């Protein structure tokens, strides 16, 4: 095809459609909706925008997502603590952290860790340290450690702190070694202090669920992963990833 | 999710044709109710706590055994969880009303609801009654014209559970 011919054609349709409108605001609006076509064609003078790559360990596959696939408006809003924010959006970030770690806002019950909240708001601890101290607390231990065997604890902790499902037998194997040896604190420390967490979320960004449209999605854990990214996930007690990767 | 506009656009995009008369009729119908639905959504957003209060009062007056020992709502924690579930149902009904579509209810409420309530032992019939009670309270609060629109999505939730 000829890109110049396409640009001329789109300009011609812009002029024609502007002709029928007979109203300045309508003309400028449709002109903008055609200028987006012209601008995108002109912007792709070099190659198309680079595909977003999700890196991985030697146990799980490395994947790419076309940049076109991500920017359909479905990307989750990152909740970041800037230490200069005012109180309202500071509370907003704290509530996002609670929703992520405990799958829901536990202010519905009046449950919170007040000193941890104060420390994260005022900057003594970061959002990463807040997430770690929040997953190591008595509340998390009561909600997501006691009712579960260590394998299910492993999987739900992946969901709560990494924003994703386990992708490998080696992954569940290593994190079961860690949990079985060191308990909940060791498991949460291993998840938060890993390279992937700092890669994706960092010090100041609350974790989020990295489901379809956020990153490239693995194919091999699809059904189990999307069972896990569901509020009915704690209602299941049998582990679903060690069993799957053994199957 | 979807809304009414996205559903119409996808319906006419998968075929590959421009909007026909039926498309414009559906869009006009959706746009005509828009201001009434926005007014209702604002009234509910400002007054969700009240609607939950009278709806829960009506439910627990109709079925006292829920809040007495041996009832699924007998504990401060389980009472709080009950009213929290009522707030979910109200908020997602409002979202669906504004969207004009039930896609958000299938995606974000009904997916995993039966498993949750069957695992926890929550009575589904009593939850349907609570949703109905929120239906009457919301209809009384936002007016009949918006009451019908919101009752559509409340009935969707109720039939989704039962």
């Amino acid at each position: 095809c000829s890109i110049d011919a396409t640009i001329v054609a789109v300009q011609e349709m812009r002029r024609a459609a502007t002709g029928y409108l007979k109203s300045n605001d309508d003309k400028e609006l449709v002109g903008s909706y055609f200028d987006v076509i012209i601008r995108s064609l002109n912007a792709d003078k070099s190659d198309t925008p680079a595909d977003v790559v999700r890196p991985s360990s030697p146990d799980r596959a490395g994947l790419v997502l076309p940049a076109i696939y991500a920017l359909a408006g479905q990307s989750r809003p990152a909740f970041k603590m800037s230490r200069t924010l005012t109180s309202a959006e500071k509370e907003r970030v704290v509530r996002a952290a609670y929703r992520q770690v405990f799958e829901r806002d536990i202010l519905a019950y009046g449950q919170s860790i007040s000193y941890l909240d104060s420390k994260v708001k005022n900057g003594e601890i970061s959002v990463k340290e807040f997430i770690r101290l929040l997953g190591k607390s008595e509340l998390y231990r009561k909600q997501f450690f006691e009712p579960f065997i260590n394998s299910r604890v492993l999987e739900l902790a992946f969901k709560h702190f990494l924003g994703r499902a386990p992708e490998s037998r080696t992954e569940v194997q290593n994190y079961y070694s860690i949990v079985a040896a060191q308990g909940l604190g060791g498991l949460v420390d291993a998840l938060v202090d890993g390279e992937e967490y700092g890669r994706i979320f960092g010090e100041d960004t609350v974790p989020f669920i990295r489901d379809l449209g956020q990153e490239a999605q693995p194919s091999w854990n699809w059904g189990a992963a999307y069972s896990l990214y569901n509020y009915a996930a704690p209602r299941r007690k049998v582990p679903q990833f060690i069993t799957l990767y053994a199957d | 999710m979807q809304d009414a506009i996205t559903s119409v656009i996808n319906t006419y995009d998968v075929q590959g044709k421009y909007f026909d008369t039926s498309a414009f009729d559906k869009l006009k119908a959706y746009y005509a109710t828009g201001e009434l639905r926005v007014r209702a959504a604002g009234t509910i957003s400002a007054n969700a706590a009240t609607i939950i209060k009278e709806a829960s009062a009506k439910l627990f007056s109709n079925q006292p055994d829920l809040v007495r020992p041996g009832g699924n709502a007998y504990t401060t924690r389980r009472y709080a969880a009950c009213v929290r579930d009522m707030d979910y149902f109200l908020r997602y009904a409002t979202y669906a009303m504004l969207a004009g579509d039930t896609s958000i209810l299938d995606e974000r409420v009904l997916n995993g609801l039966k498993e949750t309530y069957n695992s926890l032992g929550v009575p589904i019939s009593s939850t349907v009654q609570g949703i109905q009670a929120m239906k009457e309270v919301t209809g009384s609060l936002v007016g009949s014209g918006a009451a019908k629109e919101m009752g559509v999505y409340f009935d969707y939730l109720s039939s989704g559970l039962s």
Binding site: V8, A9, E12, A16 | -
Partner: peptide
């Protein structure tokens, strides 16, 4: 409503616009 009126105007006249662009660039 205004945007729907604009859309009606363009969908009624769609064939003319496409044919005009094609004529401008083709043959």
């Amino acid at each position: 409503q205004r945007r729907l009126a604009i859309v009606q105007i363009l969908t009624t006249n769609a064939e003319a616009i496409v044919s005009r662009a094609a004529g401008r660039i083709f043959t």
